[PDB]
Amino acid sequence: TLTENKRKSMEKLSVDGVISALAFDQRGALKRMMAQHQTKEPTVEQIEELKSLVSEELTPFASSILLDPEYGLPASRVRSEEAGLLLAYEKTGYDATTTSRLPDCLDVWSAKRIKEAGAEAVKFLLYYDIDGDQDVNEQKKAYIERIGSECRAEDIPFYLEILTYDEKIADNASPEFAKVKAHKVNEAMKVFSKERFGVDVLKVEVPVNMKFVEGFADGEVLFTKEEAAQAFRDQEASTDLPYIYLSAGVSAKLFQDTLVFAAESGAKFNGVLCGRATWAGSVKVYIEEGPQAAREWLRTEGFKNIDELNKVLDKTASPWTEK
Amino acid sequence: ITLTENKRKSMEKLSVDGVISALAFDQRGALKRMMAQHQTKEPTVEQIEELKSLVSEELTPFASSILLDPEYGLPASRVRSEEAGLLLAYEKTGYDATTTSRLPDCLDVWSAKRIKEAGAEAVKFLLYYDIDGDQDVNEQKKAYIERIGSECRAEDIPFYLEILTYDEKIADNASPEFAKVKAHKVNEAMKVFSKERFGVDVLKVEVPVNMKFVEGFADGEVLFTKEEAAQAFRDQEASTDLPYIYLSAGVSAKLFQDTLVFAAESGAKFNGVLCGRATWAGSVKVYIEEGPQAAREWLRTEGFKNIDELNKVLDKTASPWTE
Ligand SMILES: [Ca+2]
Numbered sequence: 185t186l187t188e189n190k191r192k193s194m195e196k197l198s199v200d201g202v203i204s205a206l207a208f209d210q211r212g213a214l215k216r217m218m219a220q221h222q223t224k225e226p227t228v229e230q231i232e233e234l235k236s237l238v239s240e241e242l243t244p245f246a247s248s249i250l251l252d253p254e255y256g257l258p259a260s261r262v263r264s265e266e267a268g269l270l271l272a273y274e275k276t277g278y279d280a281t282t283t284s285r286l287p288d289c290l291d292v293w294s295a296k297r298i299k300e301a302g303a304e305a306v307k308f309l310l311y312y313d314i315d316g317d318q319d320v321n322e323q324k325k326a327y328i329e330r331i332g333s334e335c336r337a338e339d340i341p342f343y344l345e346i347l348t349y350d351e352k353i354a355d356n357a358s359p360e361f362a363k364v365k366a367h368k369v370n371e372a373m374k375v376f377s378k379e380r381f382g383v384d385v386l387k388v389e390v391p392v393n394m395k396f397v398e399g400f401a402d403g404e405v406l407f408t409k410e411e412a413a414q415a416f417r418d419q420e421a422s423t424d425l426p427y428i429y430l431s432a433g434v435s436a437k438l439f440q441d442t443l444v445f446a447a448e449s450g451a452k453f454n455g456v457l458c459g460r461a462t463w464a465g466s467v468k469v470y471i472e473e474g475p476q477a478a479r480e481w482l483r484t485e486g487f488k489n490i491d492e493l494n495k496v497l498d499k500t501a502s503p504w505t506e507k
Numbered sequence: 508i509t510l511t512e513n514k515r516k517s518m519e520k521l522s523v524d525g526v527i528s529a530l531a532f533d534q535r536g537a538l539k540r541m542m543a544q545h546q547t548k549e550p551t552v553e554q555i556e557e558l559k560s561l562v563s564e565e566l567t568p569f570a571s572s573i574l575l576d577p578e579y580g581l582p583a584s585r586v587r588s589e590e591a592g593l594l595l596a597y598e599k600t601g602y603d604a605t606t607t608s609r610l611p612d613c614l615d616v617w618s619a620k621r622i623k624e625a626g627a628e629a630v631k632f633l634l635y636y637d638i639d640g641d642q643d644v645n646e647q648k649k650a651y652i653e654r655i656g657s658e659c660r661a662e663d664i665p666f667y668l669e670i671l672t673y674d675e676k677i678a679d680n681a682s683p684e685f686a687k688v689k690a691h692k693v694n695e696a697m698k699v700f701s702k703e704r705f706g707v708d709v710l711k712v713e714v715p716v717n718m719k720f721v722e723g724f725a726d727g728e729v730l731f732t733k734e735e736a737a738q739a740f741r742d743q744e745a746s747t748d749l750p751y752i753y754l755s756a757g758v759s760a761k762l763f764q765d766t767l768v769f770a771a772e773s774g775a776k777f778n779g780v781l782c783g784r785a786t787w788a789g790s791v792k793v794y795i796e797e798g799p800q801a802a803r804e805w806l807r808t809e810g811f812k813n814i815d816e817l818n819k820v821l822d823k824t825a826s827p828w829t830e
């Protein structure tokens with residue numbers, strides 16, 4: 185039961201109950217990508233400019249765009265008139281030195297300032313290991329409670345992104361992690377669907393690593409199609425909140441086929457916040473060839489990525505205007 | 508300006524006839540240091556919890572409410588008089604003496620929601636503030652308070668903000684040097700955090716002058732005339748439209764009482780106190796050296812006389828926040 189203002193904001197972020205959002209709040213990760221292609225340190229100006237190019241060129245094809253408030257405010261002002269705005273609230277990355285990956289809001293931001301910056305939603309990323317240290321998870325749960333309350337007070341939708349991991353498993357791309365991924369994703373969704381966290385939409389991973397699923401796997405096969413399908417149904421049974429998928433930087437084609445698979449399996453997902461799968465290739469072009477060359481990439485390859493995604497969404501996603 | 512139904516009810520549970528006569532005992536680090544000067548062994552969790560419980564049980568029948576910390580004070584909160592309301596502290600104790608920023612930090616496993624669930628009628632938070640300090644540091648502080656203010660709005664619980672002033676370049680706030688800038692530090696901080704965006708319901712603040720340097724109150728050097736001190740109280744009264752209450756800062760009970768009289772005479776419309784050390788400080792030595800039963804008797808006699816004597820002064824000095 186959304187308040188009047190939260191519903192209006194949700195409408196601004198969606199079309200006919202489906203969220204077809206573009207994600208570009210990447211910061212540290214984006215800077216590292218740019219650094220691969222030039223000698224000099226990527227500048228604040230370059231980061232701000234690439235974000236503006238992506239926003240201006242691709243938001244006409246998205247129901248909304250997620251940006252960070254650190255570099256993305258200029259980009260937010262050139263988004264399509266029909267597209268809504270989400271702003272990220274978390275500091276970028278995490279400490280690889282430890283296993284706790286504790287959440288931390290941007291130092292000079294608050295839900296109120298995010299709303300004042302023109303956002304229709306506050307987005308926050310939490311790393312979560314359901315099987316992790318209980319005191320660490322207690323601190324994480326308390327942190328999300330605070331943000332949930334902020335968003336209730338400011339009357340702005342709270343989008344919580346959850347990225348799972350295992351304290352003892354170094355690489356989430358490994359077969360070892362793939363075997364526990366469904367558990368990590370689905371149980372974390374169940375926790376954060378509790379009323380006390382104030383979440384309006386969950387941004388989550390697919391509960392399987394498709395690279396290990398029969399029909400998609402090019403190497404070791406860990407799961408039959410029926411086993412993978414059951415993980416999607418388990419995900420659907422973990423929450424009654426709206427939820428949308430992140431791409432995790434797989435290829436545009438794989439993400440598309442994954443959504444088709446999710447839908448056939450019985451996942452009633454409500455759209456996507458898709459970032460890297462759409463715009464990844466623009467970074468090299470921007471750095472090596474400049475702004476105009478990036479625009480031309482975005483109008484051809486970038487458009488192809490988001491256009492094919494939109495066609496898939498049209499035949500796979502379920503409207504949140506039912507829940 | 509305007510309290511919700513629930514905030515008003517909670518405010519009433521914290522006061523008597525619009526006057527806040529609250530007993531403060533959320534001291535942690537400071538309390539531990541106090542206990543450590545009367546015994547050889549390190550103060551234990553049990554000692555800290557017990558003393559808090561003794562003070563709560565013996566003195567709350569004479570207080571409109573009690574402020575405790577969630578870390579050690581929850582048992583004590585449960586033995587308070589049925590007539591006394593409860594405030595719980597939300598900040599971590601103390602500050603890093605090595606740096607000058609004194610940045611605020613909430614207790615790691617707490618939230619406004621959990622404070623309310625633990626039975627509190629108010630969330631209390633302590634912020635150190637230097638109005639003339641580093642502007643970026645202060646921006647971070649203001650953002651942090653906005654968040655807490657929003658949390659408290661969402662949970663519909665009164666937000667008590669305590670402000671302790673300091674100067675980044677003055678080591679000792681008891682010095683004549685600090686005394687000369689205190690009115691400025693205090694009154695200007697109250698102006699800042701009285702803005703609607705911070706969501707404060709009550710300000711817990713220092714008196715805007717160091718009375719020990721005021722003519723007629725000073726036993727040593729005299730820095731201010733009574734008229735000058737009086738003008739600082741009037742300036743404080745004009746710095747906020749919110750209810751505000753005084754902390755004792757650990758001055759003697761006699762000086763604090765005289766200060767309240769002088770405040771009212773000068774034109775301050777303060778609405779009560781959150782008074783701690785000036786009331787129970789004396790029980791620490793007795794408890795450590797002599798034990799709980801001994802401490803209990805000090806409380807039923809000297810403790811009661813302290814608080815009863817304070818109450819009689821409040822009866823003639825405080826103004827009701829019904830405002
Ligand atoms: Ca279109």
Ligand SMILES: [Ca+2]
Pocket residue numbers: 377378379
């Ligand atoms: Ca529920």
Ligand SMILES: [Ca+2]
Pocket residue numbers: 420421422423424425
């Ligand atoms: Ca469901």
Ligand SMILES: [Ca+2]
Pocket residue numbers: 761765
């Ligand atoms: Ca006297």
